[PDB]
Design a protein around this ligand. Structure first.
Ligand SMILES: OC[C@H]1O[C@H](O[C@H]2[C@H](O)[C@@H](O)[C@H](O)O[C@@H]2CO)[C@H](O)[C@@H](O)[C@@H]1O
Ligand SMILES: OC[C@H]1O[C@@H](O)[C@H](O)[C@@H](O)[C@@H]1O
Length: 500
């Protein structure tokens, strides 16, 4: 039944190593990572916050709390997915700990405000560096991807012992807010609230100039940004841009959207080129996280997706363009909406979770990429685990083989006292059982090969030919064929350690 084994990973507290590079909660974590392996979890995932390590200065890396944390993990026998977290913790949902980007970068920003994504009003979003300064050498003679690449080269030099023994199996290079390839279009920070459409975050002078230069390239210098796209909390109908047969379909608006959405491809391309020549040769896999912007999916404009950077429509696959860019790099997609079901989203959201999971996992599987998921919200119900299991093996168990399509692995959000305690614990455990096709945990499964080098760079126009025509999804079963059962599952009822 091994072909059907899907690895489960838990995501560690946002603060596995505390708010100032001091690994503190080690004994708690030691007890918390004890039950997780009794549950049979394959490995864990932590952020390697850029603001904690090079916080103190240019190239002043302090891997100390982090060498100790991974020490704990290795000792627990767990695989580790590390997230190269070049973004601020605090601002999004579920962000309790608050870790900003490096103070010395934020100080550069004081001098040049345009280094942070800027909305139409001119509000500076401090949580991630605009993709416009990727190749702008203004961080004291270092450009942002130089900075991103030196941060990852240093991670390799210092974490080598873990990279050799095979504890670190996946590097997830973050490329935007929450470490996701996208724009900060729905910033709870700036008074956006779900299911609002969000805004186009492309007003800083670097992108503000990439576009005017791009406008004149196609003969239209005169062209500006969408005047009619509304505000954060509007609904499509309310704006002239996202309204049925609105400017999102006009030449000016198709071009804009092509630009805006291409910038994210390119950003992610550049930085992945580098993460690939850094980890080049390692038994690791490179991944990126793509948001799950399900609200306004059921409407024609797909507004929230268009503002977030994913130019997805009924006739244009905006998630297969992205996966085509990941293809050279032998990268994989890490999508985040797996636990939802259309049933549970507010009816006015015009949200289609299930249909977004099917689109992205299908674009990815079509591009030959390994796809993996992560739930977007705190969920401890069997419903959540069965929806996940459905999405893991769309077509279900193929005991007569390995299945057509299968997720490489799932990474549950998040480790808490509540997950490893009682009821929630026996559900999670039986969930893991089932995610492994009820086989016992196997660590010598899905062994990676030394990361090859990124293949030949391919133009924008060559990655963009995957958009058209949008293909049909891969037939998804409606429920999983190996659900949670109910409360219990194989061993019974497990009872043990609290917290202190
Ligand atoms: O631990 C990883 C990141 O967790 C949060 O971001 C999550 C977000 O809460 C969730 O809705 C989405 O599905 O995935 C992201 C990215 O994994 C923090 O906000 C991030 O700062 C962390 O990097
Ligand atoms: O902050 C972003 C989050 O907002 C929530 O209200 C939605 O339910 C989530 O799908 C989304 O990820």
């Amino acid at each position: 039944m091994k072909g059907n084994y899907v690895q489960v990973y838990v995501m560690l507290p946002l603060d596995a190593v505390s708010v100032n590079n001091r690994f503190e909660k080690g004994d708690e974590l030691r007890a918390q990572l004890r039950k997780l392996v009794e549950a049979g979890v394959d490995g864990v995932m932590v952020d390697v916050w850029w603001g904690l390590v090079e916080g103190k200065g240019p190239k002043a890396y302090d891997w100390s709390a982090y060498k100790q944390l991974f020490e704990l993990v290795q000792k627990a026998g767990l695989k580790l997915q590390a997230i190269m977290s070049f973004h601020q913790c605090g601002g999004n949902v579920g962000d309790a700990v608050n870790i900003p980007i490096p103070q010395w970068v934020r100080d550069v920003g004081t001098r040049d405000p345009d280094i942070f994504y800027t909305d139409g009003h001119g509000t500076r979003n401090i949580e991630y560096l605009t993709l416009g300064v990727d190749n702008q050498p203004l961080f004291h003679g270092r450009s942002a991807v130089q900075m991103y690449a030196d941060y990852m080269t240093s991670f390799r030099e210092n974490m080598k012992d873990f990279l050799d023994a095979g504890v670190i199996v996946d590097i997830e290079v973050g490329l935007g807010p929450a470490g996701e390839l996208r724009y900060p279009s729905y910033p709870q920070s700036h008074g956006w609230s779900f299911p609002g459409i969000g805004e186009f975050i492309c007003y800083d002078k670097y992108l503000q100039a990439d576009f005017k230069a791009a406008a004149a390239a196609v003969g239209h210098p005169e062209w500006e940004f969408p005047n009619d796209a509304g505000q954060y909390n509007d609904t499509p109908e309310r704006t002239q841009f996202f309204r049925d047969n609105g400017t999102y379909l006009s030449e000016k608006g198709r071009f804009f959207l092509a630009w805006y959405s291409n910038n994210l491809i390119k950003h992610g391309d550049r930085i992945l080129d580098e993460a690939n020549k850094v980890f080049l040769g390692y038994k690791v896999q490179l991944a990126i996280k793509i948001a799950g912007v399900h609200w306004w999916y059921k409407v024609p404009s797909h507004a929230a997706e268009l503002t977030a950077g994913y130019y997805n429509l009924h006739d244009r696959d905006g998630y297969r363009t992205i996966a085509r860019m990941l293809k050279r790099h032998r990268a994989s997609i890490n999508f985040t909406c797996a636990e939802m079901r259309d049933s549970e989203q507010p009816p006015d959201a015009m949200s289609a979770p299930e249909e977004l999971v099917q689109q992205v996992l299908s674009a990815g599987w079509r591009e030959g990429l390994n796809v993996s998921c992560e739930n977007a919200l705190p969920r401890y119900d069997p419903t959540a685990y069965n929806t996940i299991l459905r999405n893991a093996r769309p077509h279900g168990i193929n005991q007569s083989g390995p299945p057509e399509h299968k997720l490489f692995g799932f990474t549950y959000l998040r480790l808490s006292n509540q997950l490893v305690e009682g009821q929630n614990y026996v559900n999670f455990k039986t969930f893991v059982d089932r995610m492994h096709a009820n086989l016992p945990r196997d660590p010598y499964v899905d062994p990676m090969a030394p990361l090859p080098r990124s293949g030949p760079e391919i133009s924008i126009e060559m990655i963009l030919q995957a958009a058209q025509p949008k293909i049909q999804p891969f037939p998804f079963q409606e429920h999983t064929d190996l659900p949670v059962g109910p409360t219990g599952g194989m061993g019974g009822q497990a009872e043990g350690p609290t917290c202190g």
